[PDB]
Amino acid sequence: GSGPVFVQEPSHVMFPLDSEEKKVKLSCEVKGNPKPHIRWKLNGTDVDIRYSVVDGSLLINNPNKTQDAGTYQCIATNSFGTIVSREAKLQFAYLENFKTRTRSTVSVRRGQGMVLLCGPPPHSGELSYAWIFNEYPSYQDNRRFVSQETGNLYIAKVEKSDVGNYTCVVTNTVTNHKVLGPPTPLILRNDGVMGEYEPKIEVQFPETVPAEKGTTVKLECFALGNPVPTILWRRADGKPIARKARRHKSNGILEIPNFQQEDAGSYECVAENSRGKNVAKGQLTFYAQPNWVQIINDIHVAMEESVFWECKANGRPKPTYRWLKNGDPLLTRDRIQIEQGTLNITIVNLSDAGMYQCVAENKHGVIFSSAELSVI
Amino acid sequence: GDPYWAYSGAYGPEHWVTSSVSCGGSHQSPIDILDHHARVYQELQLDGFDNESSNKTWMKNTGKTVAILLKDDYFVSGAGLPGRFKAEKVEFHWGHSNGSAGSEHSVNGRRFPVEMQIFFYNPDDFDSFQTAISENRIIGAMAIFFQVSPRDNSALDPIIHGLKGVVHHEKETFLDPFILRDLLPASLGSYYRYTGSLTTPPCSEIVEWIVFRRPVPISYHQLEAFYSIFTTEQQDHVKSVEYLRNNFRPQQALNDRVVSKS
Ligand SMILES: *[C@@H]1O[C@H](CO)[C@@H](O)[C@H](O)[C@H]1NC(C)=O
Ligand SMILES: *[C@@H]1O[C@H](CO)[C@@H](O)[C@H](O)[C@H]1NC(C)=O
Ligand SMILES: *[C@@H]1O[C@H](CO)[C@@H](O)[C@H](O)[C@H]1NC(C)=O
Ligand SMILES: *[C@@H]1O[C@H](CO)[C@@H](O)[C@H](O)[C@H]1NC(C)=O
């Protein structure tokens, strides 16, 4: 005598495309008496079973990024009612080789600012970047900087020592796989030296930066310029940047670890040289996905009694709530008062028995809590 | 869709046709205008040109030129134009130093240190300049020459000041108010008219050109502001910061066309 309870609710799955398993598993193990029946959704449409389903879990033979990558959800039902799972993403993590195996020789003038473009191949998963210069890691400093967002190598002011071969090294942070691009041979063009000029901020952080609680948020800023620009980070409001923040040696990346509310607000990067100044500005806005503070628990109640049920979640922006009964949205009606994360039933009847879900959500995430109302 | 092109190099003007086939047309711009070959038209009327520009008007370094996005209503009619034309933007062409040749058009072989162009569309026939471009509709263009002068032309002050604020590719700035009329020659009486094209890819042959005969003055000091502009260029997997200089298209053959002269 019990409605469905999640034993193994769908979790995010990272499948390495060049794995050796011709199969991936999406879990949906549920316990009830009677034993629940289970169905699967993908991108909001039903999975009409090379798909297999064992003990509620969706088994895919021959996974294929194209047909299989997406957002899954399961729904479990027995005679006592229905619950819906959280969403789970199935992700294929991969990194292709660079296609073209050949770079044209490029020529730049002494004193000139330039960017060597990585042009990373098709991939899925977060990438990190390094360059190789004449067979040795390319040294970074105030004059040379590698972006971890673009993977580009920025050279503020080219000097004679920069002549040689450059290869971009790209690493998929999920599979730990590395790929090398074709070397781009670079030479001095023997016209003049480049004259002097204002810094040009060539890579920078966005005007608006969502900054997730607890994570490390990374801001970039680097400029081309002759003389080589200085890069300065500050908060517009004059408060000191937190000491926990880390600066890249070229000063081109500010990293704010364990991001918290007080770390938010407007940041500025100032690039300056003897010829002028430019500034990149952006607002970091703190956010947090919802977290359960109070869930609903099973209720056993008798006819004509009343019922008050409440769930509570934190998050930023502050979560709103909505209710499901047996998977369908439940709103205020006769006998049943639904107000944010609360449900009030004045006089219980037999028809009220069912599965209920209290849902908490903001822009950034949705969470579910589930319980059974049973009547006697 | 929008092929890379530049004012020199492997993607320079001689090579535009390789990716933008209309640049190879026979009704191309710009041209040298030989006065003795131009034939001899309602009067040119300007509307709105004397009004002060609004604070919303702004300037952008596009990498090819410095552009002024006009936010007020300026209209031109007459001079053989079919109906009324409204101004969309202004763009500039210049040399390298010391008042070197920077114009696109010339008159009797005479080039000028700068050429300013104003681009127009018929606002009644079409709801925007970009649609006009899309449909290869007729668009209007005025070409105004600048000529070296011993002292600063105060009328150019807000434009020169703006140039100082957009040294690099992609920089933008608002401008101090200016009188569009005062960037045109003192005498509007003498001008030439012909049918030609955009002087940049895609080189569409949809342009009614109004080339004013008399130049507007500019000092060597003011010119320095144009020469101080930078752009960026591409080579295989490299982007570079370069002087923006000599940003003009070479001249093209008249072919079957005649120039009219007011
Ligand atoms: C994925 O599907 C495409 C066509 O939809 C197919 O060409 C490709 O081989 C598949 N990829 C893998 C790794 O099975
Ligand atoms: C599901 O939606 C995502 C985009 O949100 C898309 O990337 C993916 O290819 C979709 N999967 C299917 C099955 O079409
Ligand atoms: C750099 O490497 C290229 C091949 O990638 C080679 O042709 C060239 O000689 C190297 N540069 C020098 C001058 O050693
Ligand atoms: C609904 O439940 C709340 C419990 O917080 C109670 O105070 C309220 O009186 C109930 N509403 C009705 C209509 O009885």
DSSP A3-45: EEEEEE----EEEETT-S-SEEEE--EEEEESPPEEEEEETTE
Q: Report the C-alpha gap between A229 and A214 in whole angstroms.
A: 33
What size, in residues, is chain A? 376
Q: How many CA atoms does the CB half-sphere of B146 hold within 13 Å?
A: 30
B12 CA to chain A: closest CA distance, Å? 17
Q: Helix or strand or coil: residue A52? A: strand
Query: Nearest CA to B88 among B158, B139, B146, B137?
Result: B139
Q: For residue A119, give the nearest of B168, B237, B241 by CB distance.
A: B237
DSSP B23: G
Q: Report the C-alpha gap between B165 and B60 in whole angstroms.
A: 9
DSSP B22: G
Q: With an 8 Å Cβ cutoff, are B238 and A198 in contact? A: no
Do the strands B216-219 and B66-69 form a parallel or antiparallel pair, or are they unpaired? Answer: unpaired
Residue indicated by tokens 């929008």: B2
Residue indicated by tokens 């005007």: A207
Mutate to test the interface with B, among A99, A102, A108 (most CBs of B within 10 A): A108
Chain A to chain B, count of Cβ pairs less than 8 Å apart? Answer: 46
Q: Please say whether the dihedral angle defined by the alpha carbons of residues B79, B81, B84 and B86, taken in this order, is positive or negative.
A: negative
Q: Report the C-alpha gap between B9 and B143 in whole angstroms.
A: 26
Q: Is residue A28 within 8 Å of A74, Cβ to Cβ?
A: yes
DSSP B52: B
Residue type, position A32, single letter = G
Which strand (E) or helix (H) includes residue B161? helix B157-164
Q: Report the C-alpha gap between A107 and A87 in whole angstroms.
A: 51
Q: How many CA atoms does the CB half-sphere of B37 hold within 13 Å?
A: 13
A113 CA to chain B: closest CA distance, Å? 5
- CATH T-level fold of A196-287: Immunoglobulin-like (2.60.40)
Beta-ladder partners of A136: A133
Q: Is residue A28 within 8 Å of A8, Cβ to Cβ?
A: yes
CATH 2.60.40.10 in chain A, residues?
Answer: 1-93, 94-195, 196-287, 288-376
In the β-sheet with A23-26, what is the strand arrangement from edge to edge?
A23-26, A57-61, A51-54
Own/partner long-range contacts of B68-72 (Cβ < 8 Å, ≥24 apart): B68/B159, B68/B162, B68/B175, B70/B180, B72/B48, B72/B180
B148 is written with which tokens? 């070296």
Taking the Cβ of residue A197 and every Cβ of chain B, the question of whether any pair is shorter than 8 Å is answered with yes
Residue B37: Cβ-neighbour burial (10 angstroms; 0-12, 13-18, 19+): exposed
Q: Is residue B105 within 8 Å of B30, Cβ to Cβ?
A: yes
Taking the Cβ of residue A186 and every Cβ of chain B, the question of whether any pair is shorter than 8 Å is answered with yes
The residues near B11 (Cβ < 8 Å, ≥ 6 apart) are B4, B5, B19
Domains annotated for chain B, with CATH where assigned, are: 1-262 (3.10.200.10)
Query: Nearest CA to B78 among B115, B37, B106, B120?
Result: B120
Instruction: Give first-to-last CA distance, chain A, whole Å.
Output: 12
Residue indicated by tokens 């509307």: B47
Q: Is the CB of A33 under 6 A from ligand 1?
A: no
Q: Is the CB of A182 under 6 A from ligand 3?
A: no
Q: Report the C-alpha gap between B210 and B196 in whole angstroms.
A: 10
Q: Report the C-alpha gap between B33 and B107 in whole angstroms.
A: 5
Q: With an 8 Å Cβ cutoff, are B237 and A197 in contact? A: no
Residues B77, B83, B89, B91, Cα dihedral to 10°? -70
Could you write out the three-class secondary structure of A246-290?
Answer: EECCCCCEEEECCCCHHHCEEEEEEEEECCEEEEEEEEEEEEEEE
Do the strands B216-219 and A276-294 form a parallel or antiparallel pair, or are they unpaired? Answer: unpaired
Biggest CA pair distance of chain A:
93
Do the strands A127-133 and A123-124 form a parallel or antiparallel pair, or are they unpaired? Answer: unpaired
Q: Is residue A144 within 8 Å of A193, Cβ to Cβ?
A: no
Vertex B212, ends B206 and B215: CA angle to 5°? 135
Atom of ligand 1 nearest to the CA of A17: 13
Q: Report the C-alpha gap between B247 and A274 in whole angstroms.
A: 27
Q: Which residues of B touch A113 (CB under 8 A)?
A: 240-241
- CATH T-level fold of A94-195: Immunoglobulin-like (2.60.40)
A156 is written with which tokens? 């503020």
B229 CA to chain A: closest CA distance, Å? 9
Select the CATH number that applies to the domain covering A288-376 from these four: 2.60.120.10, 2.60.40.10, 3.40.640.10, 2.40.30.10: 2.60.40.10
Task: Please report, for residues A80, A115, A277, A283, B164, the alpha-carbon distance to residue A200 in angstroms, rounded to integers and kept in the order given.
Answer: 66, 12, 9, 21, 14
Ligand nearest to the CA of A167: 3
Q: With an 8 Å Cβ cutoff, are B168 and A198 in contact? A: yes
Q: Report the C-alpha gap between A215 and A209 in whole angstroms.
A: 13
Q: Report the C-alpha gap between B179 and B156 in whole angstroms.
A: 9
Q: Report the C-alpha gap between B175 and B159 in whole angstroms.
A: 7
Residue B248: Cβ-neighbour burial (10 angstroms; 0-12, 13-18, 19+): buried
Gyration radius of chain A's alpha carbons: 28
Elucidation method:
X-ray
Q: With an 8 Å Cβ cutoff, are B167 and A107 in contact? A: no
Taking the Cβ of residue B242 and every Cβ of chain A, the question of whether any pair is shorter than 8 Å is answered with yes
Kindly report the protein residue whose alpha carbon is nearest to atom 12 of ligand 3.
A164
Which strand (E) or helix (H) includes residue B222? helix B220-227
Q: With an 8 Å Cβ cutoff, are A104 and B236 in contact? A: yes
Mutate to test the interface with B, among A98, A99, A104 (most CBs of B within 10 A): A104
A336 is written with which tokens? 């049943």
| E strands, chain B, in order | 32-33, 45-47, 58-61, 66-69, 75-77, 85-94, 106-107, 114-121, 139-149, 172-174, 191-196, 207-212, 216-219, 230-235, 238-243, 260-261
Q: Is residue A82 within 8 Å of A74, Cβ to Cβ?
A: no
> What's the resolution in A?
2.0
Burial A100-133 (b: 16+ CB within 10 A, else e): eeebeebbbbbbbbbbbbbbbeebbbebebbbbb
Q: Which residues of A touch B239 (CB under 8 A)?
A: 114-115, 117
Q: Is residue B87 within 8 Å of B108, Cβ to Cβ?
A: no
Q: For residue B241, give the nearest of A103, A186, A224 by CB distance.
A: A224
Q: Which CATH architecture has domain A1-93?
A: Sandwich (2.60)
